[PDB]
Design a protein that fits this description.
Chain B: One of its GO terms (biological process) is removal of superoxide radicals. 2 copies of one chain form a homodimer. By secondary structure, chain A is mainly alpha-helical. Helix content of chain A is about 50%, strand content about 10%. Bound molecules: manganese (II) ion (2 copies).
């Protein structure tokens, strides 16, 4: 079918203690796997099966109406997670961006420290399941969030927000409950340790 | 302030193995506590602080607009969880209802087994955080679900569904991840073991009053 589960760029325990191996394993091999399987089933009937996922989710307006929900959720699931594994890494940096990106950040947010707050807040104040994102939007950076597996690539009409994600954090409870339980903020603070800013800079460039 | 955290009807470990003690504890003393605290902060400015929570959530259309979301989420949170603790119990029944309620269930769903499937599916197919409910609606029972801390008492306009809940299961991942991780269906199947059907009957009776 269209989609398969990407292999991770690192081992299930590469991100310890920030994220636990068990969680990485379940998250990847079950949660992501299902988004993939279920998207594949949706794409069954359709003209859309050979599209790149990140293209597919920009065309939910074009797909069969009675598939739209299923694809939004599961194609969304797949796109969101495929990104997430790639913007994390072992042994990064204290870790921060530099270059064109650090400059972008400074202009849009004031500083990296300021950006980190604005990001953590979008993430904290996201109620129920969702994601928080750093997007490029008209060449300028902004921070935003989405419900469930919604992505800014799906446009304002569908996701409530818009822009191109270059960084995202899963704040579905499955992403952090085993290690941090209710302590979402503890999870968010640990996150910064494992961001791969090389990859995020990589995408700043593209998205420009 | 308006609200406080209710005490549970049973010990944190009363529902083992179906739900683990640690989860009950965090679920009650953190998750619910926050819904209570946050609701109290919202109610601060307002004419609505002395309402019963289950009345308050039926008047979100009446409250200040800029408080509406905070209250839907947090008063919702508080109402949902206050109910949830009360419809579970230790050492129930194989556990099932009887009386006026078993009849009601038979007429609306065909049988208890059938009802359990309809309920398990509403719960399973609920995407992201939310709840599954057994509601009374025009005297007839139905099964429905809601996003996040939405409750059918908020009406169709806000919750997407309507009716009076007499049973609900939390399918926020916080409710089951420690014990079941991704296995929501395993969680749902265990739940039937700790339903208190006496309390659910009790509500059927009340909710029948128009
Ligand atoms: Mn996830
Ligand atoms: Mn809960």
């Amino acid at each position: 079918a269209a989609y398969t589960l990407p292999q991770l760029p690192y081992a299930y325990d590469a991100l310890e203690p920030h994220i636990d191996a068990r969680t990485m394993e379940i998250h990847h091999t079950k949660h992501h796997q299902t988004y993939v399987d279920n998207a594949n089933k949706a794409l069954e009937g359709t003209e859309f099966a050979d599209l790149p996922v990140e293209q597919l989710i920009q065309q939910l307006d074009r797909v069969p109406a009675d598939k739209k929900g299923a694809l939004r959720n599961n194609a969304g699931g797949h796109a969101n997670h495929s990104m997430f594994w790639q913007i994390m890494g072992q042994g990064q940096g204290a870790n921060q961006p530099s270059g064109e990106l650090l400059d972008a950040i400074n202009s849009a947010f004031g500083s990296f420290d300021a950006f980190k707050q604005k990001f953590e807040d979008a993430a904290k104040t996201r109620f129920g399941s969702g994601w928080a994102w750093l997007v490029v939007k008209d060449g300028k950076l902004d921070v935003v969030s989405t419900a469930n597996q919604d992505n800014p690539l799906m446009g304002e009409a569908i996701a409530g927000v818009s822009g191109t994600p270059i960084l995202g954090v899963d704040v579905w409870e499955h992403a952090y409950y085993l290690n941090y339980q209710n302590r979402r903020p503890d999870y968010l603070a640990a996150f910064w340790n494992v961001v791969n800013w090389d990859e995020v800079s990589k995408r700043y460039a593209a998205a420009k």
